[PDB]
mmCIF file of C-alpha atoms in Angstrom:
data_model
loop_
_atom_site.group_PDB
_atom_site.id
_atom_site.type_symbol
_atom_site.label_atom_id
_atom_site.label_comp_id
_atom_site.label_asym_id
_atom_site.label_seq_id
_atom_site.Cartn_x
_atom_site.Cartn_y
_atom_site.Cartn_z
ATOM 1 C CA UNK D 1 19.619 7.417 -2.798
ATOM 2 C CA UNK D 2 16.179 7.681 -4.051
ATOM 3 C CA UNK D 3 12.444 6.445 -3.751
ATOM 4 C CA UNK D 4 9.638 5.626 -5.320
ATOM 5 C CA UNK D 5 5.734 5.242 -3.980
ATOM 6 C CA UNK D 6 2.759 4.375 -5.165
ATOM 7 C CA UNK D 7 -0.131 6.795 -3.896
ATOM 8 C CA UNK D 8 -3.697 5.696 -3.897
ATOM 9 C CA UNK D 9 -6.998 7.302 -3.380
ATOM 10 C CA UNK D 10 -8.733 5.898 -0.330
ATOM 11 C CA UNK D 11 -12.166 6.494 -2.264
ATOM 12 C CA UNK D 12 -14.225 7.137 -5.501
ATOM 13 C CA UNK D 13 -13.991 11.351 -4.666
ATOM 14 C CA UNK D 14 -10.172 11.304 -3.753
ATOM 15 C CA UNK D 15 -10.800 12.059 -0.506
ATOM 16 C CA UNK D 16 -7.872 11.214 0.820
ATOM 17 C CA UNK D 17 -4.732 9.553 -0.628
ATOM 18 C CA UNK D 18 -2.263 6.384 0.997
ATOM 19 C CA UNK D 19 0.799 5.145 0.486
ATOM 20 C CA UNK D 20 2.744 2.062 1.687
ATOM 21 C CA UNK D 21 5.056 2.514 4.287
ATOM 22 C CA UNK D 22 7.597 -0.099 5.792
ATOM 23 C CA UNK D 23 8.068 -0.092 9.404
ATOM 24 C CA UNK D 24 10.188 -1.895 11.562
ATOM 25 C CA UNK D 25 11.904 -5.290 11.212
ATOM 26 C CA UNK D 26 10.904 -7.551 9.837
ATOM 27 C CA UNK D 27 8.549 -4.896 7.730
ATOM 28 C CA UNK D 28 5.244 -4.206 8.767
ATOM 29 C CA UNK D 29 3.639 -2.120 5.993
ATOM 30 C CA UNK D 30 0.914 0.667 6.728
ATOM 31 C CA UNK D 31 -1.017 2.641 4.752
ATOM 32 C CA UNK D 32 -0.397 6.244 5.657
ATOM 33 C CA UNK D 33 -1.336 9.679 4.207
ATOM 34 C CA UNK D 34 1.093 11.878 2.920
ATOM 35 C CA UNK D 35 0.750 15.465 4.667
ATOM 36 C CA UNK D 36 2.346 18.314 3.191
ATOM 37 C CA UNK D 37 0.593 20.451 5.607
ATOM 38 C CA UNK D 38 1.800 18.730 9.267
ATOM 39 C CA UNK D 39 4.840 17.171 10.458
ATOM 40 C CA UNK D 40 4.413 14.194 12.437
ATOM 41 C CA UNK D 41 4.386 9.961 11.523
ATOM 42 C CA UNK D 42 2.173 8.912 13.647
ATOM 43 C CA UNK D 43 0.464 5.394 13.147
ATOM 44 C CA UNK D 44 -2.431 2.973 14.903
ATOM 45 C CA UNK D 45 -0.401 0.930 17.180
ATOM 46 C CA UNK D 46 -0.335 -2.096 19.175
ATOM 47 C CA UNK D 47 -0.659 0.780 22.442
ATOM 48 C CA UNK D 48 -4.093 2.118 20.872
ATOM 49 C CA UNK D 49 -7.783 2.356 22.926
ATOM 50 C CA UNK D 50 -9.299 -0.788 21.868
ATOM 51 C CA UNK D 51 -12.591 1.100 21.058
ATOM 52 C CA UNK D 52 -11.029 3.326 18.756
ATOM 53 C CA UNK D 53 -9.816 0.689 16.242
ATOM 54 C CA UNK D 54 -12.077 -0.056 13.762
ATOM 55 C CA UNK D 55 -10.342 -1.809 10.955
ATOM 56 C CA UNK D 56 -6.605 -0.587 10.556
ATOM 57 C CA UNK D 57 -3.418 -1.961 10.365
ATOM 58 C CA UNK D 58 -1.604 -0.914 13.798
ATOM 59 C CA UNK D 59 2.500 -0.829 14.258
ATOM 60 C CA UNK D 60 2.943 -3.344 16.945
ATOM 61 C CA UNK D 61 6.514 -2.145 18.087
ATOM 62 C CA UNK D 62 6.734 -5.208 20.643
ATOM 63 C CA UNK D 63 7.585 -7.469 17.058
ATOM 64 C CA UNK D 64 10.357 -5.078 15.512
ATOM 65 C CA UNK D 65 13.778 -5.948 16.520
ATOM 66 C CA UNK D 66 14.691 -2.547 15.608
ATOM 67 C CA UNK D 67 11.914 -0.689 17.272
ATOM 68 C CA UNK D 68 13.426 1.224 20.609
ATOM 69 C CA UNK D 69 11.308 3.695 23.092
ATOM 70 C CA UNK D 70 12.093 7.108 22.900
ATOM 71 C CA UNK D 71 11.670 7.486 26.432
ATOM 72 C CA UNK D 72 9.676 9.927 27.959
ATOM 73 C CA UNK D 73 8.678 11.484 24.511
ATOM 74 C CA UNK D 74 5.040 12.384 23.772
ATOM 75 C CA UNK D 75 2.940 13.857 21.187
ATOM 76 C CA UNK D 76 -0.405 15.272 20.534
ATOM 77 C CA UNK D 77 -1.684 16.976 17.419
ATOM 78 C CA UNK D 78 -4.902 18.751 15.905
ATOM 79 C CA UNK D 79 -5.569 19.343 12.661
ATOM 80 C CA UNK D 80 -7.417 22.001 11.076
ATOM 81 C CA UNK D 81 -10.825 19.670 10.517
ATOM 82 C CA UNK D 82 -11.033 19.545 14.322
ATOM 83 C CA UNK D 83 -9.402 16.139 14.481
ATOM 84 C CA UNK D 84 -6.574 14.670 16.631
ATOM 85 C CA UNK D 85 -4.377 11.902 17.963
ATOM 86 C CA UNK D 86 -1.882 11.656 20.997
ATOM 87 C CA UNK D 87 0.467 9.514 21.818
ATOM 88 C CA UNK D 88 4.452 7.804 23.033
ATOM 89 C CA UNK D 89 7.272 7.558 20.816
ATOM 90 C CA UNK D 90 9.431 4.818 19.232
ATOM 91 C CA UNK D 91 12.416 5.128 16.822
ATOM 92 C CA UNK D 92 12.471 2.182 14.211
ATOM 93 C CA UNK D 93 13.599 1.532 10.663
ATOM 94 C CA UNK D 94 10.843 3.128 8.278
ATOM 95 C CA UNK D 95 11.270 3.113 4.008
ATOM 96 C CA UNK D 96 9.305 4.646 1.355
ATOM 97 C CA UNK D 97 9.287 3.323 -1.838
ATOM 98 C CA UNK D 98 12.966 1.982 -1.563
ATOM 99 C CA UNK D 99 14.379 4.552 0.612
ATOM 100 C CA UNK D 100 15.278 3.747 3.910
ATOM 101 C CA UNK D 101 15.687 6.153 7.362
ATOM 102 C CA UNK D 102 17.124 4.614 10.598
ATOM 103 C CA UNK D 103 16.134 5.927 13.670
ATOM 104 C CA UNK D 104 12.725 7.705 12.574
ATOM 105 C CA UNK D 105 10.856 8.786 15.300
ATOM 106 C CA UNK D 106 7.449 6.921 14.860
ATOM 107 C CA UNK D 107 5.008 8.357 16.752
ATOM 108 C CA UNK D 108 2.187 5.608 18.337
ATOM 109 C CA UNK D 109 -1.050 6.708 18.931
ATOM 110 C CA UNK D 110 -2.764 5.783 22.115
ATOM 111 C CA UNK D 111 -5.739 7.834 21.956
ATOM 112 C CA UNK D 112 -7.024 9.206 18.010
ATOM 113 C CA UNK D 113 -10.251 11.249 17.415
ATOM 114 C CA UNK D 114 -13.241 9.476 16.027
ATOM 115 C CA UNK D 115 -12.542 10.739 12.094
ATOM 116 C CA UNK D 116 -9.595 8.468 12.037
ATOM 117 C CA UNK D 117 -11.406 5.681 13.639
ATOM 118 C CA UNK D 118 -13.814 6.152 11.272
ATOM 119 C CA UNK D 119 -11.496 5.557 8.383
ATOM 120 C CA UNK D 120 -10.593 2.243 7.828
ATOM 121 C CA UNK D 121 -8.482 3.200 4.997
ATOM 122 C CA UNK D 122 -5.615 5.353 6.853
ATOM 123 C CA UNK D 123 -3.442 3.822 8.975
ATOM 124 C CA UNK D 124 -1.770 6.628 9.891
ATOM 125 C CA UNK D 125 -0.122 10.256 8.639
ATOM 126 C CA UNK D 126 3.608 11.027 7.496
ATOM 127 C CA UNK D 127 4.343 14.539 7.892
ATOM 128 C CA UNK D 128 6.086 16.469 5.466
ATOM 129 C CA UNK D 129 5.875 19.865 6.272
ATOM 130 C CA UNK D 130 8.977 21.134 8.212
ATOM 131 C CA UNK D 131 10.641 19.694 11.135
ATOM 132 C CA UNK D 132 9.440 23.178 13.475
ATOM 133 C CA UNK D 133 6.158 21.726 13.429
ATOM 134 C CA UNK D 134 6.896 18.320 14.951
ATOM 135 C CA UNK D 135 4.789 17.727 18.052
ATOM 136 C CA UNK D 136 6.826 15.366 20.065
ATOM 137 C CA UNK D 137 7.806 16.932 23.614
ATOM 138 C CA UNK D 138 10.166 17.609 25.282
ATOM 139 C CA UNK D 139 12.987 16.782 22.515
ATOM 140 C CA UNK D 140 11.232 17.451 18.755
ATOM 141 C CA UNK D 141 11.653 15.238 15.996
ATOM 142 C CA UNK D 142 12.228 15.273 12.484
ATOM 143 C CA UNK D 143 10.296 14.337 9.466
ATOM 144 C CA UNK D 144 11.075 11.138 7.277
ATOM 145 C CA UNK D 145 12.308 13.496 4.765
ATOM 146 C CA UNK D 146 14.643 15.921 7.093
ATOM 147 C CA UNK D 147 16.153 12.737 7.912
ATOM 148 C CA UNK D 148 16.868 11.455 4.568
ATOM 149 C CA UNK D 149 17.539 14.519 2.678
ATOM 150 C CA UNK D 150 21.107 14.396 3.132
ATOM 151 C CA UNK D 151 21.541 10.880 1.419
ATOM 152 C CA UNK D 152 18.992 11.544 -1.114
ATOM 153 C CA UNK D 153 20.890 12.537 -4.975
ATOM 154 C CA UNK D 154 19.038 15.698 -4.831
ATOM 155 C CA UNK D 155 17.602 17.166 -1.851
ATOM 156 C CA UNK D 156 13.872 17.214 -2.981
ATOM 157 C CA UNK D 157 10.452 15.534 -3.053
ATOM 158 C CA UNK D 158 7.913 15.373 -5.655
ATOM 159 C CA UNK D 159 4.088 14.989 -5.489
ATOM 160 C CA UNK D 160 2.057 13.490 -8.829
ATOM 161 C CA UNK D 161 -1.302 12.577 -7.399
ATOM 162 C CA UNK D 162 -4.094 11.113 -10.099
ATOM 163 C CA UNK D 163 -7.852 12.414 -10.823
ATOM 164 C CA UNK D 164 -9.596 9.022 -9.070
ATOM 165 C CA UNK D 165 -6.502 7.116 -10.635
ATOM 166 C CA UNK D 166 -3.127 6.449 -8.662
ATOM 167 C CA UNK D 167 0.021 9.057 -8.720
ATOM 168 C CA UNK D 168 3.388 8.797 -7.157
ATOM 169 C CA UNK D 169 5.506 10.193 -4.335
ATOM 170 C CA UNK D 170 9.508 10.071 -5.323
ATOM 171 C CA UNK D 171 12.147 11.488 -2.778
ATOM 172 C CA UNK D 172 15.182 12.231 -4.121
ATOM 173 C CA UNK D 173 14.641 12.892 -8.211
ATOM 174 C CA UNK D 174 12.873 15.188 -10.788
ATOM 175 C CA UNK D 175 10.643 11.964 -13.027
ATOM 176 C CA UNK D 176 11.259 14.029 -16.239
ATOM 177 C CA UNK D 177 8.736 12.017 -17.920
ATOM 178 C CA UNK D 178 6.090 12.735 -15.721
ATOM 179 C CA UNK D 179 4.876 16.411 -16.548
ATOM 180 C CA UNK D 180 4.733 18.219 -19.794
ATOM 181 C CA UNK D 181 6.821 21.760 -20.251
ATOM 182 C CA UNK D 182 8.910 23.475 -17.734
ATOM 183 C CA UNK D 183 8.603 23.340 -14.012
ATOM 184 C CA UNK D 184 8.221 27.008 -12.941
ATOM 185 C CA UNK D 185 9.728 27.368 -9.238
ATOM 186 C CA UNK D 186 8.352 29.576 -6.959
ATOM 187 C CA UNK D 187 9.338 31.165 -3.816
ATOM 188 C CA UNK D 188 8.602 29.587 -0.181
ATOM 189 C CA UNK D 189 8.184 30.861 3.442
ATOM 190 C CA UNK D 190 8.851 28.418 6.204
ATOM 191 C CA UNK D 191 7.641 31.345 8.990
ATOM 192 C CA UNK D 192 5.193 29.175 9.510
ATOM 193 C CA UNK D 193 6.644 25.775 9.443
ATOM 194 C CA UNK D 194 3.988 25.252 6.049
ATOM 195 C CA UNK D 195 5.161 25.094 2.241
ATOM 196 C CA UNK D 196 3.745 28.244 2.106
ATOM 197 C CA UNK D 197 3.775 30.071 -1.275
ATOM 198 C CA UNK D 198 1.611 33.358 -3.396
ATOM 199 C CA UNK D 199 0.000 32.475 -6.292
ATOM 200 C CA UNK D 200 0.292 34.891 -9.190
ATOM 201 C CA UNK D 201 -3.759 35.250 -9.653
ATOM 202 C CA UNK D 202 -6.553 32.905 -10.945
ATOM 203 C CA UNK D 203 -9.081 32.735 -13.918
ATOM 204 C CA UNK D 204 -12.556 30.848 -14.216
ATOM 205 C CA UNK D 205 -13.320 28.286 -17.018
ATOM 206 C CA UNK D 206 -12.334 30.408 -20.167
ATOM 207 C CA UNK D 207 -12.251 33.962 -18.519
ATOM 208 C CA UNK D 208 -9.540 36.186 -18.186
ATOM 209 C CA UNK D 209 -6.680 36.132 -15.563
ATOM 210 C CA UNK D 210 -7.422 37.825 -12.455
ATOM 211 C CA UNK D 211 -3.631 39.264 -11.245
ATOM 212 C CA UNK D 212 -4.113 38.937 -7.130
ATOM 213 C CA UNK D 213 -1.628 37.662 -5.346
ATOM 214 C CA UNK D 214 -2.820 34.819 -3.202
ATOM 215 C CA UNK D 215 -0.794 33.509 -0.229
ATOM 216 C CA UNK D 216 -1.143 29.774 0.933
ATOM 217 C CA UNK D 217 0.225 26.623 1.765
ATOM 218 C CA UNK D 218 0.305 23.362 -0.850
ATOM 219 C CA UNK D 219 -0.900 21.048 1.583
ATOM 220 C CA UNK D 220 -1.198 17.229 0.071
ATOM 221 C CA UNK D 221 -3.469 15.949 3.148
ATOM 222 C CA UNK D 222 -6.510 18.646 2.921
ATOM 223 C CA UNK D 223 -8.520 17.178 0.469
ATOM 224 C CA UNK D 224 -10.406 20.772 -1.108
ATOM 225 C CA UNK D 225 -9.133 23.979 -2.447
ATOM 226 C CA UNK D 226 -9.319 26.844 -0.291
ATOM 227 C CA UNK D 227 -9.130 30.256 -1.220
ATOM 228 C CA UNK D 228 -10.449 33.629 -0.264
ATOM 229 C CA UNK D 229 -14.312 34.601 -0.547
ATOM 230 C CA UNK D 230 -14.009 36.667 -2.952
ATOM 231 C CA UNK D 231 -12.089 34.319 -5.564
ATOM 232 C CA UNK D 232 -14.549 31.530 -4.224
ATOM 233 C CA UNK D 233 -17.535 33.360 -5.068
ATOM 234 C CA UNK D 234 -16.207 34.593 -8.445
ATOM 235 C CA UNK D 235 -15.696 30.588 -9.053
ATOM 236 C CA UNK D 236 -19.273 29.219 -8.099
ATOM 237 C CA UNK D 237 -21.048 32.573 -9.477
ATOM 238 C CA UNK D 238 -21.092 30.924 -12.837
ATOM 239 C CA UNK D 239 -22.472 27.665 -12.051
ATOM 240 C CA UNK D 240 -26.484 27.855 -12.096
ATOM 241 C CA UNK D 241 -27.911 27.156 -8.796
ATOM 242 C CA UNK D 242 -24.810 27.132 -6.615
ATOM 243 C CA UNK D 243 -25.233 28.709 -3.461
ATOM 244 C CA UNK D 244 -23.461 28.637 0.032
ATOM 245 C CA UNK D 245 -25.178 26.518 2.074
ATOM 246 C CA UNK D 246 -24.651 27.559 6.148
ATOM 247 C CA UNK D 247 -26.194 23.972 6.858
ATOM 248 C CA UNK D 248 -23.564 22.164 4.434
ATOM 249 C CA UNK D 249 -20.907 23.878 5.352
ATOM 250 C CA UNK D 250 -19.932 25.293 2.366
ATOM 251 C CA UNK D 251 -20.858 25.669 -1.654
ATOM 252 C CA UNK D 252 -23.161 22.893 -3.347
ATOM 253 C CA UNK D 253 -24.077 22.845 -6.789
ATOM 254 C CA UNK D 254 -26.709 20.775 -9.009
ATOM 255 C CA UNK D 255 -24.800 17.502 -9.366
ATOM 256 C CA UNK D 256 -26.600 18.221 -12.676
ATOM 257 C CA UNK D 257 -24.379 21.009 -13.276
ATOM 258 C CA UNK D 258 -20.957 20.732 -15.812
ATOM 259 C CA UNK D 259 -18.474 23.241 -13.693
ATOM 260 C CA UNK D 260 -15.819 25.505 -15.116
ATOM 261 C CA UNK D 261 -12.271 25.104 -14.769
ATOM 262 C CA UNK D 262 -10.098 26.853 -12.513
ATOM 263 C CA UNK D 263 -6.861 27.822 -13.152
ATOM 264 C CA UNK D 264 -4.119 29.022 -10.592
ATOM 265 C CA UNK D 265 -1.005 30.999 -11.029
ATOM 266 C CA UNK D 266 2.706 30.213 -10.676
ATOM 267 C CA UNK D 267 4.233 33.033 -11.531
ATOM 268 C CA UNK D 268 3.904 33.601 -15.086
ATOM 269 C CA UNK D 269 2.345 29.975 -15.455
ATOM 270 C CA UNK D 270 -0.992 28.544 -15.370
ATOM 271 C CA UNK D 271 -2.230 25.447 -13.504
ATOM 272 C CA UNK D 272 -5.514 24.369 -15.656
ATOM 273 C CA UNK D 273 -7.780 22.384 -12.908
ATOM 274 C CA UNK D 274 -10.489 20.872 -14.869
ATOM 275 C CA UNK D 275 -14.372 21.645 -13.731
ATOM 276 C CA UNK D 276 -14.585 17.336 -12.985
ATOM 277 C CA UNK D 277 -11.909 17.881 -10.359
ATOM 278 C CA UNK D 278 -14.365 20.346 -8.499
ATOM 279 C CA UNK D 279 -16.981 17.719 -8.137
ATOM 280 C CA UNK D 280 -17.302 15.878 -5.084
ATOM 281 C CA UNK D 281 -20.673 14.244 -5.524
ATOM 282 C CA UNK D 282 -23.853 14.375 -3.441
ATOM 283 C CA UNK D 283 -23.832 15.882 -0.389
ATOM 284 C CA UNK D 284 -25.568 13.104 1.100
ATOM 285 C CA UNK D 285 -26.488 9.707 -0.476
ATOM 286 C CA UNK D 286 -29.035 10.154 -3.254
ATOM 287 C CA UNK D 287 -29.216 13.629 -3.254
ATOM 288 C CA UNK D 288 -29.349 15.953 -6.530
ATOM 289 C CA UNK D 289 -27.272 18.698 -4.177
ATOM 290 C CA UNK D 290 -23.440 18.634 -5.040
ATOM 291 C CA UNK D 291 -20.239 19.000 -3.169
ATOM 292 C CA UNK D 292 -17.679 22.057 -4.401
ATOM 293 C CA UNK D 293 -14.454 21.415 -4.462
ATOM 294 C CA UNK D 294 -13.182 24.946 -3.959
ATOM 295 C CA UNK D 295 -14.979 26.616 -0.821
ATOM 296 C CA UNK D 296 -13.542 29.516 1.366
ATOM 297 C CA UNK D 297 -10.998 30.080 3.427
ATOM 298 C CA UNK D 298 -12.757 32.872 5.580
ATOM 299 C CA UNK D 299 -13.083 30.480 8.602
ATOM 300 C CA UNK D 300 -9.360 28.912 8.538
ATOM 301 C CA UNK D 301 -6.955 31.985 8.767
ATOM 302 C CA UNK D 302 -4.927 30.804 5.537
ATOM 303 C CA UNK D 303 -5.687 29.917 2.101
ATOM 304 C CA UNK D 304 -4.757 25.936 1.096
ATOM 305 C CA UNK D 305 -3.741 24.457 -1.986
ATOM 306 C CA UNK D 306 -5.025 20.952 -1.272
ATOM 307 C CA UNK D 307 -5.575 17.877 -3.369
ATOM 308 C CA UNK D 308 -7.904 19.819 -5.797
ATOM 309 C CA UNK D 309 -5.450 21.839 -6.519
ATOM 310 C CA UNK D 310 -2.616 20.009 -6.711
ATOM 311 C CA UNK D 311 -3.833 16.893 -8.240
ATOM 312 C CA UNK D 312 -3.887 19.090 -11.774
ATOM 313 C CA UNK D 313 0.029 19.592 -11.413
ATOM 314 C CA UNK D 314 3.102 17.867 -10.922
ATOM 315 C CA UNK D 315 4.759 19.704 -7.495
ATOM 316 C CA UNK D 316 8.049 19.704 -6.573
ATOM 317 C CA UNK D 317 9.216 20.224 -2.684
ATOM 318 C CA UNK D 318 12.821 21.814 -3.085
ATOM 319 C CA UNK D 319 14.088 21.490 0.534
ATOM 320 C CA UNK D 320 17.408 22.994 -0.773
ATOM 321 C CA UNK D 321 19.090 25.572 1.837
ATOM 322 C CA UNK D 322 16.182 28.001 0.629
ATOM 323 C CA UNK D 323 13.358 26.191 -0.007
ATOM 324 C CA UNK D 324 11.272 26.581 -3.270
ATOM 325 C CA UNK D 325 7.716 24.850 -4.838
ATOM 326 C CA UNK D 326 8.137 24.216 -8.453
ATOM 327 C CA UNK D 327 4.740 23.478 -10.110
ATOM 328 C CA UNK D 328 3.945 21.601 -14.164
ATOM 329 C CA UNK D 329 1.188 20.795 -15.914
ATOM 330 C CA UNK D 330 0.935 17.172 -16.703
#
């Protein structure tokens, strides 16, 4: 089998990306972010805190004939922008893009952090890191894509997300047509539970390649690039009037400015992210101070290739025996 999905940014910055999801029967379709970097589906429900729902579509499990408690199964995640969501446990039908799991365990929330509240646009997240990150207690659960792997034609999942345009998600298939060149693979960790990879070294706009290996995790639901100060420094250092702003929380530029490219690399290939992709407008409405797209990873512990990052490639998440990341330009 195989899939195919659609992939939208949620804004005018790409702050976020969501994809249709079909759950239960008949099909109630949410809008859920595609995570990379975590490993729960968790959705706004029927079961969540009143107060905390502020415009999204909820899973009402009480209307899907195929929707059964997992009983006495919990869950309760935080992210790494201090947010969160906790919750009970149903297994129901759930398809992406054509492809169909039985028996996913869809994780309600009761209770979700006010972020996600906030955001009217995400109706929940589906985790695609691995399966040893899965929150639900005392019996873990596996991701949509643990569960379908077996019946997919080829054991993999591919991420094409657009520069404030629409991508894809396919499960299952290598879209031939959808990169230019080769795909270079690249080696993975899963110590971590995390798609966790070393890039080969980086360069800014048209300077020369910096060999460094830098370890991190592609991670499709952090928005920014994160890398270490020293990279991240090197980056902003030629953009006139950049600074680190404490108060921010993080580089600004003159939205004036024109940025640099950065490029990444995968093993003896380059991953060209154009200086607009580093843009992500003023830090407050109306003001002439900027956004960066690549800040540090000082303060997190591990270096992320998010959206930034990944939007300039097409990625492919080889969940073969050994696990691999293949990366193309596009």
């Amino acid at each position: 089998s195989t899939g195919s999905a659609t992939t939208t940014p949620i804004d005018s910055l790409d702050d976020a990306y969501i994809t249709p999801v079909q759950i239960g029967t008949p099909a109630q379709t949410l809008n859920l972010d595609f995570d990379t970097g975590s490993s729960d589906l968790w959705v706004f429900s029927s079961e969540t805190t009143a107060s905390e729902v502020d415009g999204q579509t909820i899973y009402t499990p009480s209307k899907s004939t195929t929707a059964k408690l997992l009983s006495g199964a919990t869950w309760s995640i935080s992210y790494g922008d201090g947010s969160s969501s906790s919750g009970d446990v149903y297994t129901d039908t759930v398809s992406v893009g054509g492809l169909t799991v039985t028996g996913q365990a869809v994780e309600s929330a009761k209770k979700v952090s006010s972020s996600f509240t906030e955001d009217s646009t995400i109706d929940g997240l589906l985790g695609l890191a691995f399966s040893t990150l899965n929150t639900v207690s005392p019996t873990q659960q596996k991701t949509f894509f643990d569960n379908a792997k077996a019946s997919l034609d080829s054991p993999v999942f591919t991420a094409d997300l657009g520069y404030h345009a629409p991508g894809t998600y396919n499960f299952g298939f290598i879209d031939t047509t959808a990169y230019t060149g080769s795909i270079t693979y690249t080696a993975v960790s899963t110590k971590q539970g995390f798609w966790e990879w070393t890039s080969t070294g980086y360069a800014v706009g048209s300077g020369t390649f910096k060999s460094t290996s830098i370890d991190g995790i592609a991670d499709t639901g952090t928005t920014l690039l994160y890398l270490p100060a020293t990279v991240v420094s090197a980056y902003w250092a030629q953009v006139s009037g950049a600074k680190s702003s404490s108060s921010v929380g993080g580089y600004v530029f003159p939205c004036s400015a024109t940025l640099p490219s950065f490029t990444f690399g995968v093993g003896s290939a380059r991953i060209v992210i154009p200086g607009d992709y580093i843009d992500f407008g003023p830090i407050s409405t109306g003001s002439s101070s900027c956004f960066g797209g690549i800040q540090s990873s000082a303060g997190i512990g591990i270096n992320i290739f998010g959206d930034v990052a990944l939007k300039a490639a097409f990625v492919v998440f080889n969940g073969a025996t050994t696990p691999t990341l293949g990366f193309a330009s596009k």
